[PDB]
mmCIF file with all atom_site columns, C-alpha atoms in Angstrom:
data_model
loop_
_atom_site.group_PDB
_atom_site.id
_atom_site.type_symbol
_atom_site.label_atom_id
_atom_site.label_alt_id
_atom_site.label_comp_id
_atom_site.label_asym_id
_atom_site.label_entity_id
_atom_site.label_seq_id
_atom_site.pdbx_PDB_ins_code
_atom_site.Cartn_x
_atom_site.Cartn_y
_atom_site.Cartn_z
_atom_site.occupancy
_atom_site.B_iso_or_equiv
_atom_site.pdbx_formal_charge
_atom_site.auth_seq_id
_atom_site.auth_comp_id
_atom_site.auth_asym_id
_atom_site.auth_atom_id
_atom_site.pdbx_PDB_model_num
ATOM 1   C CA . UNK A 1 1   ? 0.000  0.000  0.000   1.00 0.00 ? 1   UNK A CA 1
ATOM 2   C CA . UNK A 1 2   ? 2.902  2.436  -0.397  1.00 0.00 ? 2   UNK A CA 1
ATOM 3   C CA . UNK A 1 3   ? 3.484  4.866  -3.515  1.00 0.00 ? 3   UNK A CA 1
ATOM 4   C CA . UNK A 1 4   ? 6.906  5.439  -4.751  1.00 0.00 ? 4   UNK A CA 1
ATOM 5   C CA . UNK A 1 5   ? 7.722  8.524  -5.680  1.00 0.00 ? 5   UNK A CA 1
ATOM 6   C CA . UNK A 1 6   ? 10.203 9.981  -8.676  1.00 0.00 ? 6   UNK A CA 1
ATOM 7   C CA . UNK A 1 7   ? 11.234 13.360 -9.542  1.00 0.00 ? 7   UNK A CA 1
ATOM 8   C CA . UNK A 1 8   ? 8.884  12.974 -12.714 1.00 0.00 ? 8   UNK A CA 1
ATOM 9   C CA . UNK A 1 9   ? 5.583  11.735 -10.924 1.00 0.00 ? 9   UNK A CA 1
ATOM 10  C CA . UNK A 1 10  ? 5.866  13.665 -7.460  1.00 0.00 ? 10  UNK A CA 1
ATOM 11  C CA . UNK A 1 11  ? 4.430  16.486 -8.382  1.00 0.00 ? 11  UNK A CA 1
ATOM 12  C CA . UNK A 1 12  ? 1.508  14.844 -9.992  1.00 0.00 ? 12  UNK A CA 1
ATOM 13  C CA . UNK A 1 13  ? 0.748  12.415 -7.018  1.00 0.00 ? 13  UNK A CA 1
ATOM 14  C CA . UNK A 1 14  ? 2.035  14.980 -3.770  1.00 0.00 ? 14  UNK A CA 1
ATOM 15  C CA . UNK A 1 15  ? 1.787  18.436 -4.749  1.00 0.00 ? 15  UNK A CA 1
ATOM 16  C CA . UNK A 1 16  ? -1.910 18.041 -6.991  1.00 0.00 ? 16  UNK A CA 1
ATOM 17  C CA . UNK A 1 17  ? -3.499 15.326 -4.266  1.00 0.00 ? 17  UNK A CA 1
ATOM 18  C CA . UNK A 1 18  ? -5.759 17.195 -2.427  1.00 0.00 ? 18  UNK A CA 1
ATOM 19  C CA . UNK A 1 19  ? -5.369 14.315 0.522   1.00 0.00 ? 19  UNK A CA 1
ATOM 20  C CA . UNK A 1 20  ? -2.916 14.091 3.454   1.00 0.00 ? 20  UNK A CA 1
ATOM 21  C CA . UNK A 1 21  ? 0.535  12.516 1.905   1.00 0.00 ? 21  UNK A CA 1
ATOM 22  C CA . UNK A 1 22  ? 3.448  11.101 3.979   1.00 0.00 ? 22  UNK A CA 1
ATOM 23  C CA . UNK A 1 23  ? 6.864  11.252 2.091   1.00 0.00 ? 23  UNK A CA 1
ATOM 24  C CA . UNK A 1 24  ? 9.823  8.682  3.312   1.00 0.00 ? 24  UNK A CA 1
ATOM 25  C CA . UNK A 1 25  ? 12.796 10.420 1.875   1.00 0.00 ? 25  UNK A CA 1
ATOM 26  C CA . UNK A 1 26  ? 15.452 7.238  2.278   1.00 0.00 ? 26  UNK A CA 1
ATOM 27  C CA . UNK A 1 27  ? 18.675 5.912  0.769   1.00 0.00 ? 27  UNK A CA 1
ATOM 28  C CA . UNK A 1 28  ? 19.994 2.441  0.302   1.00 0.00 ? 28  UNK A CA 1
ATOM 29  C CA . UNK A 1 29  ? 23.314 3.102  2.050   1.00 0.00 ? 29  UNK A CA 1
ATOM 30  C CA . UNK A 1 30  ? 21.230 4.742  5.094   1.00 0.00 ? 30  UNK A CA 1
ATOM 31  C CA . UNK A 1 31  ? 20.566 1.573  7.652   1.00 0.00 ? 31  UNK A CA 1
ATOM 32  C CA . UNK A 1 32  ? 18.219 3.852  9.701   1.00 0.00 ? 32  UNK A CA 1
ATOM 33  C CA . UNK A 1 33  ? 16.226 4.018  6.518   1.00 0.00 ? 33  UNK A CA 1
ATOM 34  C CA . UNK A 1 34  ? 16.129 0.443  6.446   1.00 0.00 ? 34  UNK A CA 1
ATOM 35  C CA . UNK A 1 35  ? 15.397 0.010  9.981   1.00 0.00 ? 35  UNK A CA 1
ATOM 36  C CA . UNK A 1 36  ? 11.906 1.912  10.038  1.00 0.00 ? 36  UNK A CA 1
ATOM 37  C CA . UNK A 1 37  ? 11.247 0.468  6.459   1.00 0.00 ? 37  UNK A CA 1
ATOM 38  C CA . UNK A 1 38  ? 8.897  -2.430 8.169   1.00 0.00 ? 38  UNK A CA 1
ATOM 39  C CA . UNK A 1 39  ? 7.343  0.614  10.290  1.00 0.00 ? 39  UNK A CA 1
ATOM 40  C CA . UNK A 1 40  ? 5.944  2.704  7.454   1.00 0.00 ? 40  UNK A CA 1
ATOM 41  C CA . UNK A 1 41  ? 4.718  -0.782 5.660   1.00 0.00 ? 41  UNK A CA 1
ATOM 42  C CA . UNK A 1 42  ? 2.646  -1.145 9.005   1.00 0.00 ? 42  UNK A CA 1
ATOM 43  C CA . UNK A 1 43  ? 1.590  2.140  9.107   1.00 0.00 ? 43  UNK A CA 1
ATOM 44  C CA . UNK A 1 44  ? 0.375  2.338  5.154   1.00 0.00 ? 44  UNK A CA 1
ATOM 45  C CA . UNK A 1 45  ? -1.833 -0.534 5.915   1.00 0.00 ? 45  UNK A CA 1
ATOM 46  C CA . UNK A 1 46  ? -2.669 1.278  9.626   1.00 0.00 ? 46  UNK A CA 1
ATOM 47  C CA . UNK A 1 47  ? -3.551 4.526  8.608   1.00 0.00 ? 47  UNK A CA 1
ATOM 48  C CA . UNK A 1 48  ? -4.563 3.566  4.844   1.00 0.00 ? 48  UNK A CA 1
ATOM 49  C CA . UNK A 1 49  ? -8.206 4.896  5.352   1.00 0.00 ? 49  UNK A CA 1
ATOM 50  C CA . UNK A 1 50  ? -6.601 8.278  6.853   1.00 0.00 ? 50  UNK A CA 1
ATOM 51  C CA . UNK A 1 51  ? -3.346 9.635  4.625   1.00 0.00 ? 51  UNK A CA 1
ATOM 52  C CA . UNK A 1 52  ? -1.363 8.260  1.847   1.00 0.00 ? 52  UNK A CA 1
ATOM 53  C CA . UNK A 1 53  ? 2.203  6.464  2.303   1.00 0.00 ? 53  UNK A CA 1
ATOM 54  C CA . UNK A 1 54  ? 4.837  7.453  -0.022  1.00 0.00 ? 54  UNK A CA 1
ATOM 55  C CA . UNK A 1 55  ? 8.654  6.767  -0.169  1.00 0.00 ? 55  UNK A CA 1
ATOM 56  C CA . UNK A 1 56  ? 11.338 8.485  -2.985  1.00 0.00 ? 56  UNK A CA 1
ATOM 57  C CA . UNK A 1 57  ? 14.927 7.088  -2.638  1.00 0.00 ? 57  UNK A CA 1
ATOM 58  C CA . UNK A 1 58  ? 17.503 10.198 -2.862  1.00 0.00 ? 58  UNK A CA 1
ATOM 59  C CA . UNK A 1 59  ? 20.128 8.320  -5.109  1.00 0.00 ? 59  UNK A CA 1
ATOM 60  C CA . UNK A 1 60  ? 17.733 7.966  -8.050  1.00 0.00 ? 60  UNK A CA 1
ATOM 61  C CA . UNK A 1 61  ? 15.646 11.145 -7.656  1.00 0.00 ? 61  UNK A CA 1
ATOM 62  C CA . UNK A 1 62  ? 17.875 13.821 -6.343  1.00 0.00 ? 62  UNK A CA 1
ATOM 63  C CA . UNK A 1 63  ? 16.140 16.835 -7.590  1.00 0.00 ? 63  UNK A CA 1
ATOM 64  C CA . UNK A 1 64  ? 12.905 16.767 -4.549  1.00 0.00 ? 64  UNK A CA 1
ATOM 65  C CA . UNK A 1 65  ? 15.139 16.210 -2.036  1.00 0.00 ? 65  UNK A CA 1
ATOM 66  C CA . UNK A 1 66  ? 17.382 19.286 -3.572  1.00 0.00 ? 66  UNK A CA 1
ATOM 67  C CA . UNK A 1 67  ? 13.958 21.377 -3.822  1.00 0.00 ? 67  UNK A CA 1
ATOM 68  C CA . UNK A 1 68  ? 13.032 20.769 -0.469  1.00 0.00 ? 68  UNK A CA 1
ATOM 69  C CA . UNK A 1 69  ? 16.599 21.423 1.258   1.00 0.00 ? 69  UNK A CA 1
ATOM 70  C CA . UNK A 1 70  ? 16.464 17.693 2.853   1.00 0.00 ? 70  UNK A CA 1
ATOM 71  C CA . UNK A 1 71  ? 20.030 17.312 5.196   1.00 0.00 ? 71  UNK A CA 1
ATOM 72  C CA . UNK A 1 72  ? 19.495 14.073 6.554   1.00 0.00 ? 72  UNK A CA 1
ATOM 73  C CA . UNK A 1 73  ? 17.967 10.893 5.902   1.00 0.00 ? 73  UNK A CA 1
ATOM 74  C CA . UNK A 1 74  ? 15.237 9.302  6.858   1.00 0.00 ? 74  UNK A CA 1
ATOM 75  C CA . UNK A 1 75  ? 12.976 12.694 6.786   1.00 0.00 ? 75  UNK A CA 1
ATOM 76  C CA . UNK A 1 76  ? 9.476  12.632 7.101   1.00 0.00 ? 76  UNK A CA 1
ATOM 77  C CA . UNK A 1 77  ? 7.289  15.284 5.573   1.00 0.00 ? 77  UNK A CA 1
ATOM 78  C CA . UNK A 1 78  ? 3.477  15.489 6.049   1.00 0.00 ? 78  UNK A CA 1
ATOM 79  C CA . UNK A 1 79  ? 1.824  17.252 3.058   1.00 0.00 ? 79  UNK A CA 1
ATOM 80  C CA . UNK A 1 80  ? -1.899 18.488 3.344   1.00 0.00 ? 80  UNK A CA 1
ATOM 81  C CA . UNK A 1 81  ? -3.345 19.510 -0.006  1.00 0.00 ? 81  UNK A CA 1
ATOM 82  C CA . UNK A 1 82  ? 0.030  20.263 -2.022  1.00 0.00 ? 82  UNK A CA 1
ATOM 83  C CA . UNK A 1 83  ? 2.268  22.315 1.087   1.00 0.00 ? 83  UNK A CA 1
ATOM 84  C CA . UNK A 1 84  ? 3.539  20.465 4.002   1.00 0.00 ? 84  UNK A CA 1
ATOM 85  C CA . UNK A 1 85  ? 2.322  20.531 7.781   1.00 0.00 ? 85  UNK A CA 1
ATOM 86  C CA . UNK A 1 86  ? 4.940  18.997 9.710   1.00 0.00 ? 86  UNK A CA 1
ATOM 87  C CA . UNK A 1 87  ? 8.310  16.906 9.527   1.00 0.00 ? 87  UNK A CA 1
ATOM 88  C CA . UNK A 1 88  ? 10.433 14.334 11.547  1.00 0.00 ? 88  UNK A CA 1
ATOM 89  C CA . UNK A 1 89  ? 14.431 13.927 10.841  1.00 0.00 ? 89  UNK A CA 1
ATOM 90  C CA . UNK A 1 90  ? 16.018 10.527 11.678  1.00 0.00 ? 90  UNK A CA 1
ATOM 91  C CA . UNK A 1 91  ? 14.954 6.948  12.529  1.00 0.00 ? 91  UNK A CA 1
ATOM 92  C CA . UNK A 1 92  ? 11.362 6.733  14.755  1.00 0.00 ? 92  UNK A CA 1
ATOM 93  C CA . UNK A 1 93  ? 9.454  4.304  16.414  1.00 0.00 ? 93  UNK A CA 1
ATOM 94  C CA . UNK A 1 94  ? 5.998  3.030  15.649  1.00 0.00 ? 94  UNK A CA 1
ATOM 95  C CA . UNK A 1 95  ? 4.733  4.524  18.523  1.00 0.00 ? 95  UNK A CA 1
ATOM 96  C CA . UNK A 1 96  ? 6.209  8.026  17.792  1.00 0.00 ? 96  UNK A CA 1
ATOM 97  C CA . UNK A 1 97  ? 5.231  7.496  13.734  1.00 0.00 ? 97  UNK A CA 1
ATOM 98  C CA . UNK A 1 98  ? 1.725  6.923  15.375  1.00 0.00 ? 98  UNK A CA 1
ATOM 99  C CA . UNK A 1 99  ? 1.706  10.063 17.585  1.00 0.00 ? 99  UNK A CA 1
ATOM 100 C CA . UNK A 1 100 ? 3.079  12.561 14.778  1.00 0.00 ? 100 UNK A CA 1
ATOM 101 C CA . UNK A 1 101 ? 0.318  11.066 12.861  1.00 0.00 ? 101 UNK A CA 1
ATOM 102 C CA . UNK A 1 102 ? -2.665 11.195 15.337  1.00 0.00 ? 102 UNK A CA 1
ATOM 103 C CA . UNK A 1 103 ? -1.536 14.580 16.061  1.00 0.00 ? 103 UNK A CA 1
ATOM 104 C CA . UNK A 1 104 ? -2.923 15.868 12.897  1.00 0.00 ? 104 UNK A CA 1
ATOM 105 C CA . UNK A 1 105 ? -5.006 13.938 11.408  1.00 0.00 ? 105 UNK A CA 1
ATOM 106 C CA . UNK A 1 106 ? -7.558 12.714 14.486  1.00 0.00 ? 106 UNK A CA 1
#
């Protein structure tokens, strides 16, 4: 239940959805990417009814990360129509990912 994002189609699916989207900016090479990877599955499936789970990996679409003036990975950012609401830097657990979430959405 996750969308993955490009340079090409983010625009189209992120900044035109009218919904809430959450963005996974992650890398390969970054291990605490990997290590919430199983989290954000959960949490697509969770919160599918609510939001919209998306991930774009840095190495193969550079130019969103670039736009958006992303330091680190993993960053979170929640959009709401086409500008974003809030963002979380670095690895998370479930139960955090939940609060962020429940914190503006319920």
């Amino acid at each position: 239940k996750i969308l993955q994002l490009t340079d090409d189609s983010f625009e189209l699916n992120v900044i035109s959805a009218s919904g809430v989207v959450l963005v996974d900016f992650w890398a390969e090479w970054c291990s605490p990417c990997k290590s919430i990877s199983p989290i954000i599955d959960e949490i697509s499936i969770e919160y599918a009814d609510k939001l919209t789970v998306g991930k774009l990996n840095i190495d193969q679409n550079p130019v969103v990360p670039t736009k958006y003036g992303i330091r680190s990975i993993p960053t979170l950012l929640l959009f709401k129509s086409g500008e974003v609401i809030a963002t979380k830097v670095g690895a998370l657990s479930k139960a955090q990912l939940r609060e962020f979430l429940d914190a503006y959405l319920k």
